[PDB]
């Protein structure tokens, strides 16, 4: 029930083989898997908690220029030399100046000049890698127990953490079984290509090559005192005014510019425990060992009373809060979904098995009624409470929503999205392979282009495809244009 009302929940219903079903646990989303006779339970990825980060580069933003010194020489007497050049902290640039007899030099012409200034760095930026022997994903598993305090609770679940070295685990659900995890944590995100920079109590998951490309003075990052910065010329700016003299500036703090230059990065919570809260993970669920816990119970023989008025979730299912009244025992909850006057059983139970545990706590039965006018009966007797609820929408709307959700998933996961809720089908492997090849070509072609650039190129390709008289060219260009438009529309986030 932890995944009720989230708004990003996606159902998984099919099972195959040994009841193993794979699911891709996107961090924001939460998967609510269900089966024919297994306890329906919802899953989400809590945190991935990178730990023991090792730094490798400090790059500066705020410098400070001290001890500006200059030397000058007559024309045709060589470059100006200054003893401070052979020091790491000194940044020194040559230039040319003009001088005649007014400057004490007999020869008329252009003279050399140097200006060395010691550059000190204040408030550097650390960039830290993460090694895979110290990364701890965390998966929380919650069963649809029907508990009183479970409807939207964010703290009721069974934690089952996984590390890349210890891939598989077994989370023992209390009095339900053992949800075997054959998860694959290595393919989720490639932290080898991503290094984690932290500046001024903030963090971002930037690409490694992009970090290595940006123009700021870096250093070894060995945590020693007086580090020597490479490429100091990116902060100091020498300004020869009228070929008379030279001046030095420090150019100020690059913090705001750096914040702008992180426009596509994803922020994480380095503060406290370096807890990364962005990413995704794929796993498969071995439901062979689970048990229903409710098969041996008897039918509840007395009337119910609902506490909270029936409220409908964002995904079209119905959530009910009933409380047992008459009989004193833990019993199975009768349930049926008849129509207005036709007795057609069409409503499914999202909860695997509703059971009153104590009779003093209400139950949290959730159901998915068919769209239209359908009655709900939750009692064995004639005095059973009757709930009539009119659902909106049609199967066309559900199909459109499913198609949009699948397209948006494939626009993010990409290759991995083809085996989101896969049951191991032979055709699904073929589809995943084809999508993998095509996406590997597509991202190679389109890597590093803006969202607006993608839209422009896509509309241009669509125009080319429409105009061209070649069938192959027309079809390929139209397809690529449509794909590029739909991708560029949703790329930014």
């Amino acid at each position: 029930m932890r995944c009720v009302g989230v708004g990003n929940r996606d159902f998984v219903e099919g099972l195959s083989g040994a009841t193993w079903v794979d699911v891709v646990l996107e961090h924001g989303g939460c998967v609510t898997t269900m089966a024919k006779n297994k306890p329906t339970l919802d899953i989400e990825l809590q945190k991935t908690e990178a730990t023991q980060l090792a730094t490798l580069r400090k790059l500066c933003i705020e410098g400070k220029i001290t001890n500006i010194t200059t030397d000058s020489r007559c024309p045709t007497q060589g470059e100006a030399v200054l003893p401070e050049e052979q020091d790491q902290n000194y940044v020194c640039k040559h230039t040319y100046v003009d001088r005649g007899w007014g400057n004490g030099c007999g020869l008329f012409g252009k003279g050399s000049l140097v200006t060395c200034a010691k550059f000190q760095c204040l408030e550097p930026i650390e960039g830290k890698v993460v090694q895979y022997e110290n990364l701890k994903y965390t998966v929380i598993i919650t069963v649809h127990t029907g508990d009183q305090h479970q409807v939207g609770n964010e703290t009721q679940g069974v934690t089952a953490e996984i590390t890349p070295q210890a891939s598989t685990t077994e989370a023992i659900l209390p009095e339900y079984g053992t949800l075997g995890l054959e998860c694959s944590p290595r393919t989720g995100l490639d932290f080898n290509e991503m290094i984690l920079l932290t500046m001024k109590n903030k963090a971002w998951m930037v690409h490694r090559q992009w970090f290595f490309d940006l123009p700021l003075p870096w250093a070894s990052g060995a945590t020693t005192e007086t580090p020597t910065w490479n490429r100091k010329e990116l902060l100091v700016t020498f300004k020869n005014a009228h070929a008379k003299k030279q001046e030095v500036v420090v150019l100020g703090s690059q913090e705001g510019a750096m914040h702008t230059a992180l426009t596509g990065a994803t922020e994480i919570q380095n503060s406290g425990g370096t807890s990364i809260f962005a990413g995704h993970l794929k796993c498969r669920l071995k439901m062979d060992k689970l048990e229903l816990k409710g098969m041996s119970y008897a039918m509840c023989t007395n009337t119910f009373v609902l506490k909270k008025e029936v409220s409908e979730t964002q995904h079209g299912t119905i959530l009910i809060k009933v409380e047992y009244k008459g009989e004193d025992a833990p019993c199975k909850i009768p349930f049926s979904t008849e129509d207005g006057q036709g007795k057609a059983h069409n409503g499914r139970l999202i909860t695997a098995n509703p059971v009153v545990t104590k009779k003093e706590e209400p139950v949290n039965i959730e159901a998915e009624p068919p769209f239209g006018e359908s009655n709900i009966v939750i009692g064995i007797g004639d005095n059973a409470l009757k709930i009539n609820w009119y659902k909106k929408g049609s199967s066309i709307g559900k199909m459109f929503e499913a198609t949009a959700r699948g397209a948006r998933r494939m626009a993010i996961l990409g290759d991995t999205a083809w085996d989101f809720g896969s049951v191991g089908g032979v055709l699904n492997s073929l589809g995943k392979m084809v999508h993998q090849i095509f996406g590997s070509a597509y991202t190679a072609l389109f890597s590093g282009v803006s969202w607006v650039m993608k839209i422009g190129i896509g509309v241009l390709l669509t125009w080319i495809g429409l105009n061209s008289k070649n069938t192959s060219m027309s079809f390929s260009c139209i397809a690529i244009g449509i794909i590029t438009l739909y991708l560029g529309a949703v790329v930014q986030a």
Partner: antibody, heavy 122, light 113 residues
Framework: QVELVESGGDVVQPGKSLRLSCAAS????????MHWLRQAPGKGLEWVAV????????YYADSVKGRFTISRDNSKNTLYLQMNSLTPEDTAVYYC???????????????WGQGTLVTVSS | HIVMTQSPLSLSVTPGQPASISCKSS????????????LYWYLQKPGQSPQLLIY???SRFSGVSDRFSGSGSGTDFTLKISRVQAEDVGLYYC?????????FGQGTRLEIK
């Protein structure tokens, strides 16, 4: 946004040594030269000692030279001042001044600590 | 050991009026290599900690009101306030940063007349 808070100030009899501590926050400490300054009551501001960015280099005011010791615990982000052979004259409100954020001088003051009071009397 | 002598020792001025403080050095505080002049002006407000108003002879520090401006070239420097408000009570300690044993001035006092 930077915060420099004093610590260690208390009463002390003449001749008894005292160790002052300047806790720092709001900036990277290891890159900043730090200073100690004092203001005797009703007297002009008088700079005491300076420690530069490198820990080894230190300097002291001649009026207090040879009586004090200045140390930097940059791992804990705090500054240490060791006062030895205190004199009843050496009673004042003591400050902790950061290096200048922008400028040319290797040593300057831009942000002053809240201030601590040390009293040397019998 | 450059000693800083300030011309005014007490400046009682009415609000909305100018004010001129002088801090005269015993030696030119003009560093030869860069040509800058390292003279600083602090203000310790009563019951407060000193601030930094002009971190050079005439380049004012950040967060300082619009009216505080300095001058002076070799030894005769000034601190000009355009319009005095009621918050200007304090002690305008000047300072020289040219030499390592830097010494403050005695510091003038400003009050509302």
């Amino acid at each position: 946004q930077v915060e420099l808070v004093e610590s260690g100030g208390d009463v002390v009899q003449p001749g008894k040594s005292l160790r002052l501590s300047c806790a720092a926050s709001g900036f990277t400490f290891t890159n900043y030269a730090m200073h100690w300054l004092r203001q005797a009551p009703g007297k002009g501001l008088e700079w005491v000692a300076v420690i530069s960015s490198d820990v080894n280099d230190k300097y002291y005011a001649d009026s207090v030279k040879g009586r004090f010791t200045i140390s930097r615990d940059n791992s804990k982000n705090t500054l240490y001042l060791q006062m030895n052979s205190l004199t009843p004259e050496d009673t004042a409100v003591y400050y902790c001044a950061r290096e200048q954020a922008v400028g040319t001088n290797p040593w300057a003051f831009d942000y002053w600590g809240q201030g601590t009071l040390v009293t040397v009397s019998s | 050991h450059i000693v800083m002598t300030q011309s005014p020792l007490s400046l009682s001025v009415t609000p909305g009026q100018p004010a001129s403080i002088s801090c005269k050095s015993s030696q030119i505080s003009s560093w030869g290599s860069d040509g800058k002049t390292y003279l600083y002006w602090y203000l310790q407000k009563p019951g407060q900690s000193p601030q930094l108003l002009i971190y050079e002879v005439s380049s004012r520090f950040s967060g300082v009101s619009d009216r505080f401006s300095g001058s002076g070239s070799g030894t005769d420097f000034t601190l000009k306030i355009s319009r005095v408000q009621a918050e200007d009570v304090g002690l305008y300690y000047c300072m020289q940063g040219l030499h390592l044993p830097l010494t403050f001035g005695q510091g003038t006092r400003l009050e509302i007349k």
